[PDB]
Amino acid sequence: SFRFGQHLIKPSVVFLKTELSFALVNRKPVVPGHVLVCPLRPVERFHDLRPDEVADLFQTTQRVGTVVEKHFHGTSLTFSMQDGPEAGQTVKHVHVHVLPRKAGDASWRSEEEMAAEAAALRVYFQ
Amino acid sequence: SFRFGQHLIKPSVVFLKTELSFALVNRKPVVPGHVLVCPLRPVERFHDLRPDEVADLFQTTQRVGTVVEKHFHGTSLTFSMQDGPEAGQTVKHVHVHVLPRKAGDASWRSEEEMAAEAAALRVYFQ
Numbered sequence A, B: 001s002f003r004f005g006q007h008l009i010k011p012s013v014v015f016l017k018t019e020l021s022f023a024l025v026n027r028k029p030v031v032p033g034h035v036l037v038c039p040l041r042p043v044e045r046f047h048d049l050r051p052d053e054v055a056d057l058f059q060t061t062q063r064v065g066t067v068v069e070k071h072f073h074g075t076s077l078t079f080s081m082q083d084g085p086e087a088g089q090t091v092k093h094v095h096v097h098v099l100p101r102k103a104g105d106a107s108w109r110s111e112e113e114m115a116a117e118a119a120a121l122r123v124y125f126q
């Protein structure tokens, strides 16, 4: 019941929802803990977001980064937004990739394993 | 008169300053138009920023991205924050790399050429 470009994301894989944003787990996380933070409104380019949505997106991203870094035992974090076709954007919805990083750092999993991961992550936002 | 880790940045290379953030040009931009957006307060990790500083950092980053994409003739933008030593952070100050991207995309320059670039960029924020 969350849009992400032209697909519907099941709530089971969403671990945080705010008044303007939501965070979800990935089917193929690039690194363990690789999650996405998106505005609820499906806009394609970052400049399309209103200031309130910009503040919310990133304050949410900040909270999520802290949680995933902790949960997946990272010691740093990479935050990246591929804003546009020439930056590599595949899904036409603004979103931030949040990746826990460890020193010296296929991944495909079932919806059930994604849902289990989202359930673990929700605990940190209670 | 702007801190960036343990170095002072001359105003001549700063093209935007808000109540909580500032943007500057690079000595060796990775791509033309590669600029940095930083909070005025020198904190090392993204989780250290207050919510108001998070909102300001990214609303500023949004405005800067629009300007540099326009000025350097990009058609997209890459936004990246290397948050921590294991994410590649060299300067211990939170900052966002903003890079205009073009289809199919040493760079060292003098302070004067950096100052000329910052002066061009300020025009867009008048």
Ligand SMILES: OC[C@H]1O[C@](O)(CO)[C@@H](O)[C@@H]1O
Residues within 6 Å of the ligand: A032, A071, A072, A073
């Ligand atoms: O996903 C990472 C999680 O899995 C473990 O390695 C095994 O349970 C945990 O300590 C960590 O929280």
Ligand SMILES: OC[C@H]1O[C@](O)(CO)[C@@H](O)[C@@H]1O
Residues within 6 Å of the ligand: B032, B071, B072, B073
């Ligand atoms: O730095 C990019 C700037 O330089 C030019 O290529 C030459 O003046 C411009 O059109 C552009 O605004």
